């Protein structure tokens, strides 16, 4: 679990969005596993606008942060799950690092701000949904 809070927006994994997120929907994209909902309170986070390929992510299954080198956002094949059929997920960045399903929502940050959130993983890999291209979040 986990979310980014920026301005009057809450960014979550689309497969983990709540009834309240869908009732206050701003934008969603199943191909990116992202959903953004509106909030009444001002958010605590700021978004990176950069081309960093290194950063640090929070891993809830280890209660720890880990450093990572990650690929540029791209179209990656993701196997079927209880949430989606087998498909290509877009704007996804992969890295070597531990992750389990419940780790989705952990933030990846570089020195400039929030880069994205954990969205996929397996066998020593972790994948992050990029948010740096969503200029309207600011
Ligand atoms: C950190 S998620 C993870 C980690 C380790 N084994 C497996 C997984 N699970 C996954 O990758 N998925 C299940 C939830 C929906 C994800 C999607 N973005 O399509 C795919
Ligand atoms: Zn950066």
Swiss-Prot record:
Active site positions: 15 (for protease 2a activity), 33 (for protease 2a activity), 104 (for protease 2a activity)
Protein name: Protease 2A
Residues engaged in binding Zn(2+) 1: 50, 52, 110, 112
Membrane-spanning residues: none
Record text on subunit structure and interactions: Homodimer.
Catalytic reaction(s) noted: Selective cleavage of Tyr-|-Gly bond in the picornavirus polyprotein
Shown chain mapped onto the complete sequence: 869 to 1006 of 2193
Stated role: Cysteine protease that cleaves viral polyprotein and specific host proteins. It is responsible for the autocatalytic cleavage between the P1 and P2 regions, which is the first cleavage occurring in the polyprotein. Also cleaves the host translation initiation factor EIF4G1, in order to shut down the capped cellular mRNA translation. Inhibits the host nucleus-cytoplasm protein and RNA trafficking by cleaving host members of the nuclear pores. Counteracts stress granule formation probably by antagonizing its assembly or promoting its dissassembly.
